[PDB]
Design a protein around this ligand. Structure first.
Ligand code: CLA
Ligand code: CLA
Ligand code: CLA
Ligand code: CLA
Ligand code: CLA
Ligand code: CLA
Ligand code: CLA
Ligand code: CLA
Ligand SMILES: CC1=CCCC(C)(C)[C@H]1/C=C/C(C)=C/C=C/C(C)=C/C=C/C=C(C)/C=C/C=C(C)/C=C/C1=C(C)CCCC1(C)C
Ligand SMILES: CC1=C(C/C=C(\C)CCC[C@H](C)CCC[C@H](C)CCCC(C)C)C(=O)c2ccccc2C1=O
Ligand code: SF4
Ligand code: SF4
Ligand code: SF4
Lengths: 139, 161, 42, 80, 742, 74, 60, 74
């Protein structure tokens, strides 16, 4: 499960669009995926890179950059084998996506619903009713 | 006269307006020979200017201290030709246009594709409608009293509030 | 005359341009024969 | 973070979940609708506030609602 | 013979059916309107061919026939200019007295008193004075009569009919295949050799056989109806050898390479003709002959069907060094498969050429009697500066459309585009720093001067009579150009332009051209120009470089070239598309070109144009106030805008009252644009809801549901009315001012 | 005299905008529709499209003809 | 109601609140919003159909 | 001249009143945002969906009426 730090990165000549000091002092994101070919893709941060046949690994600054690349690999090269991690400067690696092995757009057992409100949106409470009160506007 | 104004026919400033307007054209005419096209053009403009000033003087318009006609619009009948009668003519034409456009939007609602009738107008039917507008006051008031002009408040979509 | 060409002449921009050109045109003609009508003559 | 809510008018179309660029939303099981599923917002700390989910939602008024709140590095979209 | 003609016969049927079906060209619009947005979406996307069709062949066919349609419109326009010169103009009177008669080729009908616009332009004529410089063109061509203007009008109509026929034929009857359009070597060979080279050679032949004898007789003083018709010069070689004795030798000196025989009519004089204040037409004839020779030579460079020539692909791929990776590899494929990439290049070059035209035509006046027709000089400089600025901003618009749509990273690995995109932060941060440095040290000098003059400290100002910022490099270049005749251009007799220095050329006691001295005010306003150009480049380049993705939006290419935003998150991403940098860069183009045309107008009135009184002293239009008043903003406000707006605002009741009305109307349209620019769509949709309610109440709601304009369309409408109002206000101000005083 | 008139009219315009702004803040934040059942306030909100459309008409009515007469005379 | 009947919408936040639609289907399960209603106007999203209940739908 | 400027003042008053009244009465909700009161008085927009919602808050109607107040006092 854990990120194998030794996975070879896709060939890239560098760019100014990569990560900055905030990645080495706050958090960094990593994405791995399997390619059946040694083929050119577009980096979210700049120009073009070449993914190597076998396992690839990238480092990006934002989670949205890792997922924009994931969307791209799935749409064009049909690579659904992508795993997205968060990495803290303490060395702790946090697996992110897909969070339970199944893509979020597919249902899975053992997922608990967060944020679900039992009524429709027009049944919320008026702001005056909950003024100087801690009660939430969602009923 | 009304509001301390002077009839334009006896205003001295109106007369100086007419004279200055004609001297300005005559000095442009002083630079052309008699039968030339610019001479005929300016002589026809001097005739038009004099005709306008003469017509304004004899119409019952009132001039100010500046020598320009002023319009009285308080409702008095001696001056109804400046706002009340042009206004009646306008409201007849405007109500015609509104009545005819409304008749066509109600026709177009009962069409096979109602929104195609509004970018491609059915010209024979729309001309049938434009002819009907000459009696819009009677048609529209009978439409009103027969309960077909105004829709009740509960068939109109409104914001939740 | 072709029914598709007449269906083209019934389109909104053509009718709008023709009707407002005809409208502008009889305002222009009325002000040619009857100019400087500041008031309804009465 | 931003606050994302799903109301019980959700028809379980999964469109919000597919449109989210930051994997905030996912589908959970629910007997209320015909599709047998409802959208959920377990990872709002990653919500950037793009409101692509609200754009994707087809119910008459949005079943998913984003309420922009306190800003963080994640929700500000800062790569620096 | 891999360069061949290939055509599909009868591709598209000439039918009126799709005329009756608005929106037929796209799948979205073809199903009909449901909201008013459909109407706007119909017009917005109609000539976006590569948005309707996938195939490059159908796109190319549509483009070729639409270019024939544009040519048909241009020929109709030219034919109308010739017909109005023939029928409704004082051209014949102007030929006799070019310095007294004011050109006029537009006459108004008398309807609501508007016949006051028929002012006394001279020559027993009344009409609207025209400033396009057509009269001087016709005199340079050697027209000399309204009859020949009728024949030019008919030639324009025939060409217009042939172009609209060719567009119909080449779309509906015989449409070329994609492999015909993808012949870049053949197209360049024919357009250099055939179009430009034979265009120049044929025009040189006309100048030599018609323009030179007719204009020599005119400048000798012969009356226009006393001058032989242009074909009697073609036949009677003795009559031509009277004016130019070299014609006694015929074409033997040309073929035997004894070219110095032709120095009668192929000169290298330089300077201006003293009689007309224009370029020597013998120089223009030699210029066009020499340009013809090397355009025909240049159109033999590329390889078509016989092995001689260059392959443009090989030239591009061979130019690569150690800093730039694979080099120009893949650029041929880009420029032979993307119309947008070609349009980006060709629009930037055409706009630059129009800006060069504006500078070169005021400084080296090419036509007879155009230099002392000051309304024409100001009109054609201002007009070609605006055409140049617009076309440059469309070059960056179509560079963005290419990057968003036609760019493919797989075919562009490690070449020049890949490397520009991979250091776009270094480019945009250094340009950003330059624009800040250059606004501080150009406009901040103006603010320093406003403050010092206001505080009573005139010894602390940047001025000629104080701390001096002299343009030594520009002054040095002017020195070299005055020294060039006989020194570094030894066979030239005069300077290229008297703007560099030298004599005062006066025609009809008005200055044609005279040295344009550069001082502290010129240093300041040239750095104003460099600042506004650098900022416009910054906005347009940042839009092109970040069109596909940013640190802000990592997938900007999936949203397209033209999208309003990607939501209020990430702090807010309003105006993040490449379209929105074209939108923002057209404001800065407007700012740049407005300062350029103001600099030209004030400098020419203050230091060049005017009247030459006895003793050779020159009285300029505004009396040399540029030097001491263009160094402060208060000087530009008071001595240029306030002082020179006197003619527009006092124009009521004269022939220039139309300019007074357009001055006010354009002020209106400009202000009205700010309603669309400062506002948002959500307010206007909620207001439309209450208006829709009042229609529902009377049962008169439309079936095409009214919508507020889109976010992008609110921006486009605001920008269109802003530019229309601002350019219109300057158009009226410039024309009434220079018609009254010049 | 000129400065005093201008000063107090600008103060007047700011105070009038602020009164409408704080009425909007009242409706958003402090208005409870259930303590105001069928009031003058609730009935105002009940015919807010009649109010807004008749302001729209009178603004357009004034604008078309005032600007039309000014442009007429111009 | 029944399939095919014309109904006046009573959901105050519907785009078609107090407008007329026509009922397409009615679910029989434990669905919270079982009435499917189609309209001739599109909403601001360009949708012309929506699910409702029985207290927010009245026959006309 | 006083007649024409009085009508211009009336046009300016009724239009500033329109913008401010429309902001106050649509503050709680509208058809684009029927739940506008849940977001407050001053929020940027509701995003690009539903056609676009720039300047949809009641605060933005204060913002827009400030230009018309400046115009009328002018
Ligand atoms: C191409 C540029 C151009 C321009 C800008 C002008 C401009 C003008 N011309 Mg010139 N003209 C031109 C070319 C041009 N002309 C050419 C090529 C010729 C040679 C045939 C002439 C010959 C000519 C003459 C002989 C005269 C003018 C006149 C005029 C003036 C008034 C025209 C007018 O009001 O008639 C308006 C006439 C109408 C019939 C109104 C038509 C309005 C319709 C509705 C426009 C609709 C277009 C249509 C909807 C397009 C879609 C088609 C449809 C199937 C959908 C005006 C200054 C007049 C002038 O200067 O008098 C002193 C005049 O007498 N022109
Ligand atoms: C000698 C050959 C030749 C010449 C003169 C031209 C000329 C032109 N081409 Mg090109 N073209 C050529 C060969 C040539 N082409 C070849 C071989 C190809 C295939 C690779 C193309 C493919 C091509 C495309 C794809 C396009 C053009 C376009 C154009 C026009 C550019 C706009 C312009 O400046 O027109 C204005 C300038 C003019 C001088 C107008 C002249 C009109 C006629 C057609 C010029 C020639 C007349 C005739 C030969 C002269 C007779 C002289 C006689 C009196 C003695 C222009 C008419 C563009 C266009 O507008 O298409 C219509 C365009 O999109 N051409
Ligand atoms: C600002 C308010 C105001 C209003 C609404 C009116 C309204 C009217 N005035 Mg005016 N008026 C005003 C102020 C006003 N006035 C002022 C301040 C003065 C100066 C004192 C006048 C002086 C004035 C005169 C001198 C006359 C009017 C008349 C009229 C009436 C004629 C219209 C008509 O056709 O009706 C009546 C006709 C029909 C209902 C049907 C006709 C077919 C109308 C009711 C005229 C009138 O008839 O008085 C009643 C008239 O002679 N007015
Ligand atoms: C004939 C159709 C028609 C009718 C009966 C009405 C009727 C009304 N409109 Mg609407 N309106 C229409 C068309 C129509 N409108 C169109 C096309 C527009 C878009 C420009 C508007 C924009 C509009 C606004 C912005 C407002 C109204 C308002 C009003 C009301 C007061 C009258 C008024 O202010 O007129 C004003 C009319 C205009 C500003 C524009 C009218 C433009 C032309 C002249 C009308 C359309 C002619 C049409 C093409 C007919 C073709 C018929 C043919 C096919 C047979 C009243 C409910 C006001 C309101 O709600 O007050 C209660 C208001 O604020 N209307
Ligand atoms: C919307 C576009 C537009 C409009 C309406 C005008 C309008 C005008 N132009 Mg301008 N012009 C434009 C764009 C435009 N221009 C652009 C983009 C360029 C740059 C190529 C020029 C360059 C230009 C020149 C050089 C001249 C005009 C002149 C004129 C005036 C007379 C028109 C005429 O008969 O031409 C007549 C034009 C000529 C007699 C000579 C033209 C010679 C050039 C070199 C021909 C080049 C053609 C070639 C195919 C273009 C290649 C472009 C290159 C980048 C490859 C008129 C004010 C003339 C003027 O100021 O007269 C007072 C003039 O001499 N124009
Ligand atoms: C396409 C452009 C063009 C065209 C159609 C012409 C056409 C013509 N030229 Mg011109 N010419 C041109 C360009 C052109 N020229 C240029 C660029 C130059 C400068 C080198 C000349 C210099 C020139 C001279 C010096 C003469 C001609 C002559 C002629 C005529 C040729 C008669 C002949 O062969 O006997 C020529 C005589 C011989 C002894 C051989 C003919 C009307 C002759 C003529 O008739 O003049 C009116 C003539 O004497 N041409
Ligand atoms: C040779 C020149 C040329 C060509 C062929 C094109 C072609 C194209 N451009 Mg480019 N463009 C150009 C020059 C050019 N442009 C210039 C000079 C600019 C700078 C302003 C741009 C800026 C630009 C942008 C920003 C965009 C395009 C887009 C497009 C495409 C869609 C065109 C369309 O449907 O519009 C339809 C045409 C109209 C709606 C016309 C209305 C435009 C104005 C407001 C009307 C003109 C006002 C008039 C002149 C004055 C009125 C007088 C007044 C007093 C009443 C098309 C491929 C669009 C696209 O998506 O491409 C993929 C796009 O987004 N272009
Ligand atoms: C000079 C600038 C200007 C002008 C004229 C307007 C005009 C208007 N604004 Mg806008 N506004 C402006 C600046 C301007 N605003 C600015 C800077 C802001 C700050 C962002 C706003 C913010 C604003 C808001 C927030 C609101 C308005 C509203 C209004 C309307 C109020 C006046 C009215 O109801 O009838 C006056 C009507 C007119 C002046 C229309 C003129 C008639 C035209 C010119 C007819 C000409 C037709 C002609 C043939 C077209 C030729 C086209 C050509 C291509 C052929 C009117 C449409 C309000 C509104 O719409 O309520 C109804 C509204 O709510 N405006
Ligand atoms: C937005 C909003 C939401 C809800 C809450 C909220 C704060 C309440 C609200 C704000 C509302 C706001 C901001 C409302 C603003 C309301 C205003 C500015 C009302 C102005 C009223 C003036 C009147 C009635 C003058 C009467 C003069 C007369 C009768 C003179 C008579 C005469 C005399 C005596 C002498 C001369 C002769 C004549 C002419 C005969
Ligand atoms: C006034 C305004 C509207 C409403 C404007 C509308 C509905 C345009 C009105 C057009 C009417 C329907 C026709 C009048 C057109 C003119 C008479 C001439 C138009 C010329 C071209 C359209 C051909 C917006 O939708 C908007 C959106 C985003 C930012 C700012 C704004 C904004 O300021
Ligand atoms: S989009 Fe709206 S409806 Fe479809 S799933 Fe997400 S929330 Fe439920
Ligand atoms: S707002 Fe953007 S990020 Fe937050 S949930 Fe909706 S889509 Fe995912
Ligand atoms: S909607 Fe209007 S405001 Fe909200 S983000 Fe898109 S553009 Fe900016």
């Amino acid at each position: 499960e854990t990120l194998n730090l030794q996975i070879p990165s896709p060939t890239f000549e560098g760019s100014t669009g990569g990560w900055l000091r905030a990645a080495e002092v706050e958090e960094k994101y990593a994405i791995t995926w399997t390619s059946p070919k040694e083929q050119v893709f577009e980096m979210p941060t700049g120009g073009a890179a070449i993914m190597r046949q076998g396992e690839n690994l990238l480092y990006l600054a934002r989670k949205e950059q890792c997922l924009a690349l994931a969307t791209q690999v799935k749409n064009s090269f049909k690579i659904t084998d992508y795993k997205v991690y968060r990495i803290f400067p303490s060395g702790e690696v946090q697996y992110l996506h897909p969070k339970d092995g199944v893509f979020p757009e597919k249902v899975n057992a053992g997922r608990v619903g967060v944020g679900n409100v039992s009524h429709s949106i027009g049944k919320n409470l008026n702001p005056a009713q909950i003024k100087f009160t801690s009660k939430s506007f969602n009923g | 006269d009304v509001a301390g104004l002077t009839p334009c026919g006896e205003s001295k400033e109106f007369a100086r307006r007419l004279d200055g307007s004609v001297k300005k054209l005559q000095t442009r005419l002083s630079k052309y020979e008699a039968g030339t096209p610019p001479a005929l053009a300016l002589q026809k403009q001097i005739d038009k200017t004099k005709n306008r000033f003469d017509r304004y003087g004899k119409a019952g318009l009132l001039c100010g201290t500046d020598g320009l006609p002023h319009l009285i619009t308080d409702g008095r009948w001696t001056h109804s030709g400046e706002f009340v009668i042009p206004g009646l003519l306008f409201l007849y034409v405007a109500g015609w246009i509104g009545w005819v456009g409304r008749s066509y939007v109600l026709f177009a609602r009962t069409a096979d594709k109602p929104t195609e009738k509004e970018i491609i107008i059915d010209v024979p039917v729309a001309l049938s409608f434009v002819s009907t507008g000459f009696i819009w006051p009677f048609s529209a008031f009978k439409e009103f009293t027969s309960g077909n002009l105004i829709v009740p408040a509960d068939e109109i979509t409104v914001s939740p509030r | 005359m072709d029914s598709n060409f007449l269906k083209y002449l019934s389109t909104a921009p053509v009718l709008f341009t023709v009707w407002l050109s005809f409208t502008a045109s009889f305002i222009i003609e009325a002000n040619r024969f009857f100019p400087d009508m500041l008031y309804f003559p009465m | 973070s931003h606050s994302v809510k799903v109301y019980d008018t959700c028809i379980g179309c999964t469109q919000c979940v597919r449109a989210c660029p930051c994997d905030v939303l996912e589908m959970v099981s629910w007997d209320g609708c015909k599709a047998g599923q409802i959208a959920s917002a377990p990872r709002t700390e990653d919500c950037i506030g793009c409101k692509r989910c609200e754009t994707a939602c087809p119910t008459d008024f949005l079943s998913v609602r984003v309420y922009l709140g306190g800003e963080t590095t994640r929700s500000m979209g800062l790569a620096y | 013979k891999k360069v061949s003609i290939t055509v599909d016969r009868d591709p598209v049927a000439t039918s009126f059916e799709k005329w009756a079906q608005p929106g037929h060209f796209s799948r979205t619009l073809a199903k009909g309107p449901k909201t008013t947005t459909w109407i706007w979406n119909l017009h917005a996307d109609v000539h976006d061919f590569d948005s309707h069709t996938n195939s490059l062949e159908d796109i190319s066919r549509k483009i070729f026939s639409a270019h024939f349609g544009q040519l048909s419109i241009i020929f109709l326009w030219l034919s109308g200019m010739y017909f109005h010169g023939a029928r409704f103009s004082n051209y014949s009177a102007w030929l006799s007295n070019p310095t007294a008669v004011k050109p006029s080729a537009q006459v108004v009908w008398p309807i609501v008193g508007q016949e006051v616009l028929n002012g006394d332009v001279g020559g027993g004529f009344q009409g609207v004075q025209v400033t396009s410089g057509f009269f001087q063109i016709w005199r340079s061509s050697g027209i000399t009569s309204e009859v020949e203007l009728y024949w030019c009008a008919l030639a324009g109509l025939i060409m217009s009919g042939l172009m609209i026929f060719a567009g119909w034929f080449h779309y509906h009857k015989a449409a070329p295949k994609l492999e015909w359009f993808q012949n870049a070597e053949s197209m360049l060979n024919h357009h250099l050799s055939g179009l430009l080279g034979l265009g120049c050679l044929s025009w040189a032949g006309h100048q030599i056989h018609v323009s030179l004898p007719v204009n020599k007789l005119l400048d000798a003083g012969v009356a226009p109806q006393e001058i032989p018709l242009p074909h009697e010069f073609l036949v009677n070689r003795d009559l031509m050898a009277q004016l130019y004795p070299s014609f006694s030798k015929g074409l033997v000196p040309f073929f035997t390479l004894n070219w110095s025989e032709y120095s009668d009519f192929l000169t290298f004089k330089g300077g201006l003709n003293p009689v007309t204040g224009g370029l020597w037409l013998s120089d223009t004839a030699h210029h066009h002959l020499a340009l013809a020779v090397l355009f025909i030579v240049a159109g033999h460079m590329y390889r078509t069907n016989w092995g001689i020539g260059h392959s443009m692909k090989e030239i591009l791929e061979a130019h690569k060094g150690p800093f730039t990776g694979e080099g120009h590899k893949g650029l041929y494929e880009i420029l032979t498969t993307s119309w947008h990439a070609q349009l980006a290049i060709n629009l930037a070059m055409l706009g630059s050429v129009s800006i060069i035209v504006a500078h070169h035509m005021y400084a080296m006046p090419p036509y007879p009697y155009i230099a002392t027709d000051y309304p024409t000089q100001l009109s054609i400089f201002t007009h070609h500066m605006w055409i140049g600025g617009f076309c440059v901003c469309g070059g960056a618009a179509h560079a963005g459309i290419f990057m968003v749509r036609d760019y493919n990273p797989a075919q562009n690995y490690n070449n020049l585009l890949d490397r520009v995109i991979r250091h776009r932060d270094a480019i945009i941060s250094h340009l950003n720093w330059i624009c800040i440095f250059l606004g501080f040290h150009s406009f901040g000098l103006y603010i320093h001067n406003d403050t010092m003059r206001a505080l009573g400290r005139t010894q602390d100002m940047f001025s000629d009579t104080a701390i001096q910022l002299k343009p030594v490099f520009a002054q040095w270049v002017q020195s070299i150009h005055t020294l060039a005749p006989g020194n570094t251009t030894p066979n030239a007799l005069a300077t290229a332009s008297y703007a560099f220095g030298g004599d005062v050329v006066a025609v009809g006691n008005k200055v044609a051209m005279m040295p344009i001295s550069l001082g502290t005010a010129d240093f300041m306003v040239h750095h104003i120009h460099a600042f506004t150009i650098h900022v416009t480049v910054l906005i347009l380049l940042k839009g092109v470089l970040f069109s596909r993705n940013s640190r802000l939006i990592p997938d900007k290419a999936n949203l397209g070239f033209r999208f309003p935003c990607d939501g209020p998150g990430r702090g807010g991403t309003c105006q993040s598309s490449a379209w929105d940098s074209v939108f923002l860069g057209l404001f800065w183009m407007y700012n740049c070109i407005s300062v350029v045309i103001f600099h030209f107008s004030w400098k020419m009135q203050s230091d060049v144009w005017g009247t030459v009184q006895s003793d050779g002293t020159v009285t300029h239009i505004t009396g040399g106030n540029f030097a001491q008043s263009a160094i402060t903003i208060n000087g530009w406000l008071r001595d240029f805008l306030w002082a020179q707006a006197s003619q527009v605002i006092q124009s009521y009741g004269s022939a220039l009252s139309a300019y007074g009305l357009i001055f006010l109307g354009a002020h209106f349209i400009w202000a009205f644009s700010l309603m669309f620019l400062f506002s948002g769509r959500g307010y206007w949709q909620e207001l439309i809801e209450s208006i829709v309610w009042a229609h529902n109440k009377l049962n008169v709601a439309p079936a095409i549901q009214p919508r507020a304009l889109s976010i992008t369309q609110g921006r486009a409408v605001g920008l269109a009315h802003y530019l229309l109002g601002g350019i219109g206000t300057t158009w009226a101000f410039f024309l009434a001012r220079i018609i009254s005083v010049g | 005299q000129s400065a005093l008139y201008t000063h107090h009219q600008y103060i007047a315009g700011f105070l009038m905008v602020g009164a409408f702004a704080h009425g909007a803040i009242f409706f958003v934040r402090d208005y409870d529709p259930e303590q105001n059942k069928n009031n003058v306030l609730a009935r105002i909100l009940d015919h807010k499209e009649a109010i807004i459309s008749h302001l729209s008409w009178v603004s357009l009515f004034l604008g078309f003809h005032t600007l039309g007469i000014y442009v007429h005379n111009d | 109601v029944k399939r095919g009947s014309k109904v006046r919408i009573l959901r105050k936040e519907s785009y078609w609140y107090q407008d007329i639609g026509t009922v397409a289907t009615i679910d029989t399960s434990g669905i919270r919003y079982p009435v499917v209603v189609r309209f001739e106007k599109v909403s601001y999203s360009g949708v012309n159909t929506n699910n409702f209940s029985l207290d927010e739908v009245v026959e006309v | 001249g006083d007649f024409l400027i009085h009508h211009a003042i009336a046009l300016a008053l009724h239009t500033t009143t329109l913008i401010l009244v429309k902001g106050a009465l649509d503050a709680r909700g509208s058809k684009l945002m029927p739940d506008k009161k849940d977001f407050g008085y001053a929020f940027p927009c509701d995003g690009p969906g539903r056609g676009g919602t720039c300047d949809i808050s009641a605060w933005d109607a204060f913002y827009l009426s400030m230009f018309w107040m400046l115009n009328t006092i002018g």
